[PDB]
Short mmCIF file of C-alpha atoms in Angstrom, two decimals:
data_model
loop_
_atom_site.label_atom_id
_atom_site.label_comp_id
_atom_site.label_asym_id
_atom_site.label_seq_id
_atom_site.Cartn_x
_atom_site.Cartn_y
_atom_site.Cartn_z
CA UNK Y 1 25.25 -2.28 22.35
CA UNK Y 2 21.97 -2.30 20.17
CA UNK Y 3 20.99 0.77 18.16
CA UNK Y 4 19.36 0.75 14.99
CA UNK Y 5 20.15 -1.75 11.85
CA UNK Y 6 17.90 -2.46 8.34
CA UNK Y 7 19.45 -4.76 6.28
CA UNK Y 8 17.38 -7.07 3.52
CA UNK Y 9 18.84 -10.20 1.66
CA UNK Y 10 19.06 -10.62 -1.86
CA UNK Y 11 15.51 -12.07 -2.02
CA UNK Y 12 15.62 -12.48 -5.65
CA UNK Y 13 12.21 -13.34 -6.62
CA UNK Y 14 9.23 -11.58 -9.33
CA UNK Y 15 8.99 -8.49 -6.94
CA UNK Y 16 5.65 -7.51 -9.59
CA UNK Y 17 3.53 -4.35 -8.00
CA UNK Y 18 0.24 -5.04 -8.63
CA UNK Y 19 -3.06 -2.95 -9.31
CA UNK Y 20 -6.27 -2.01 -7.45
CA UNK Y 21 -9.32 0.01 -7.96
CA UNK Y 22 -11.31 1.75 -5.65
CA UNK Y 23 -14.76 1.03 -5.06
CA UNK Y 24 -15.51 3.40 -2.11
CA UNK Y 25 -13.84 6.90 -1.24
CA UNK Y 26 -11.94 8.08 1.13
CA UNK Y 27 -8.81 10.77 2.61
CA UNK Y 28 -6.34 9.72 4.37
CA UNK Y 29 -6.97 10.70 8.60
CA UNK Y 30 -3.24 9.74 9.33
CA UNK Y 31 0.19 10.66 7.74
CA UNK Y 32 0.23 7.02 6.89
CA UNK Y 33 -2.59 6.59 5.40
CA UNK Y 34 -3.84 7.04 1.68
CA UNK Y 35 -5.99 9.45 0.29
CA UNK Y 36 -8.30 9.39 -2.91
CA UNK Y 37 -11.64 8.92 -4.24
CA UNK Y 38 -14.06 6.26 -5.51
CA UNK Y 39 -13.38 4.60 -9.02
CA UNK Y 40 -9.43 5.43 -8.86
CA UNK Y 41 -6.59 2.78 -9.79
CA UNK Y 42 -4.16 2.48 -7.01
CA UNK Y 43 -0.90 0.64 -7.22
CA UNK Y 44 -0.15 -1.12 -4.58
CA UNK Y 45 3.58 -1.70 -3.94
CA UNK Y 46 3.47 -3.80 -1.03
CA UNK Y 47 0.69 -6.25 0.68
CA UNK Y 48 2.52 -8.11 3.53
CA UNK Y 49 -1.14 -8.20 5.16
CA UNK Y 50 -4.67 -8.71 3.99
CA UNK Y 51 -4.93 -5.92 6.78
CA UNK Y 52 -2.23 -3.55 5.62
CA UNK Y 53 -1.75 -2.42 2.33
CA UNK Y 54 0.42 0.16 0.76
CA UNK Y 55 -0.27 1.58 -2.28
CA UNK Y 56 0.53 4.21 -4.61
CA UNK Y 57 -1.90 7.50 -5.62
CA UNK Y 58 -1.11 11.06 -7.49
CA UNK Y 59 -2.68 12.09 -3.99
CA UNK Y 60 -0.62 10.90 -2.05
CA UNK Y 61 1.23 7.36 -0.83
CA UNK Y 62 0.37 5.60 1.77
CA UNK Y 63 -2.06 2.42 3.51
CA UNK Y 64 -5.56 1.78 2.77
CA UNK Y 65 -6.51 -0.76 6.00
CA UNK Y 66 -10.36 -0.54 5.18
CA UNK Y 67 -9.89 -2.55 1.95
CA UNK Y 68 -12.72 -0.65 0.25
CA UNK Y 69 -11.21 -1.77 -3.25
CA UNK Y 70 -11.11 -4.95 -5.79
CA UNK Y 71 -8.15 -5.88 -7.94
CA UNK Y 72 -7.53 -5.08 -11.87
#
């Protein structure tokens, strides 16, 4: 047995996606990664990691690892 399973709980808590803006600029090299330029406002949905981030542009969605941003 074993295969493939993705199931969450009802983690009811203040699921809030927050805001950052970019400082420095940069496309994303990998599928994975996100792509836009200096001075934009991404939102990022999801920051398990201070090394991992996922955020949302009209560029694309995606990770921004290098952290070249600050948070408004």
């Amino acid at each position: 047995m074993g295969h493939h399973h993705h199931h969450h709980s009802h983690m009811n808590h203040q699921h809030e996606a927050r805001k950052v803006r970019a400082i420095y600029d940069f496309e994303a090299a990998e599928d994975n990664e996100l792509t836009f330029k200096a001075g934009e406002i991404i939102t990022v949905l999801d920051d398990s990691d201070p090394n991992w981030w996922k955020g949302e542009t009209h560029q694309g969605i995606g990770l921004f690892p290098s952290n070249f941003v600050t948070a408004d």
